[PDB]
Amino acid sequence: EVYKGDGYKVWKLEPSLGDPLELGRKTKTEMNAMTHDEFDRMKSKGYDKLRVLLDLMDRPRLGTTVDLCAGRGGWSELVKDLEGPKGITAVSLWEWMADPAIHRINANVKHLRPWQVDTLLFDGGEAFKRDQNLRKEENFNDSLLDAVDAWMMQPVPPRNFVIKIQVPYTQKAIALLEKWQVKTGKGRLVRLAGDRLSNTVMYFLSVRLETQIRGRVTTFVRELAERRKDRSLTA
């Protein structure tokens, strides 16, 4: 009851006014300019984080599961403990610190074409370092969401999904998320509490619909910048 709800797990993100792209670029620029003190002072591990996310989703039965950009296997390992290794397929480019019984495919996620699954996991995306054009990090993560898009738009989409959204305030990202809600009839973008302030990572979970994604991302980026200032500043 009062257990079921979130809770301090995720931020509350009600929609608000603003351009998410510009507020997102604004706090990225500010962060890039922070000194060594400010930045650090505010700056297989995913095993636990996926368990939290799946607990929020009411612990659904996973079934046939593809884990995209599986990396070291943290997410695949949790599925195997939850349901055995038979149903999991792990895709990444190659290392692998998870159960070797889990089936793996060495392939570029942007070239592997989708197939039908019960559960779609994606934990890809990368945070670029300050010495970069802002648009290059946005384009790179956009192109990864474009690949996930083909998994979500196939004739029978994933019943369950956990899709990391590394850079959620681009037009591609927001348009991709709104399209996936229409396609699947569900989906909510969450900000896990306790994620490092140094990224903009959100997660798109296959729970009951929550719309106005564009305003909630704006609220996220505005709220994150304020918390970045609080932590970076002393006294």
Author numbering: 42 to 84, 99 to 149, 155 to 295
Q: What does the report in the manuscript say about this coordinate set?
A:
Alongshan virus (ALSV), a newly discovered member of unclassified Flaviviridae family, is able to infect humans. ALSV NSP1 is a typical flavivirus NS5-like protein. It carries two essential enzymatic activities: the methyltransferase (MTase) and the RNA-dependent RNA polymerase (RdRp). The flaviviral NS5-MTase functions to catalyze the methylation of viral RNA cap.
The crystal structure of apo ALSV MTase was determined using the single-wavelength anomalous dispersion method and finally refined to a resolution of 2.5 Å, with Rwork and Rfree values of 0.209 and 0.258, respectively. Clear electron densities could be observed for residues E42-K84, S99-W149 and E155-A295. Amino acids Y85-P98, E150-E154 and D296-R313, however, were unable to be traced due to high flexibility. Overall, the ALSV enzyme has a globular fold, which can be further divided into three subdomains (the N-terminal and C-terminal extension regions and the core region). The N-terminal extension region consists of an extended loop followed by a helix-turn-helix motif (helices A1 and A2). The core region folds into a seven stranded β-sheet (strands β1-β7) surrounded by four α helices (helices αX, αA, αD and αE), which reveals the general αβα-Rossmann-fold. The overall structure of ALSV MTase is similar to those of the MTase proteins from canonical unsegmented flaviviruses. For ALSV MTase, it contained a long-extended N-terminal loop, which was not present in DENV3 MTase. In addition, following the helix-turn-helix motif in the N-terminal extension, the ALSV enzyme also featured with a shortened loop that is highly flexible (amino acids Y85-P98 being untraceable in the electron density map).
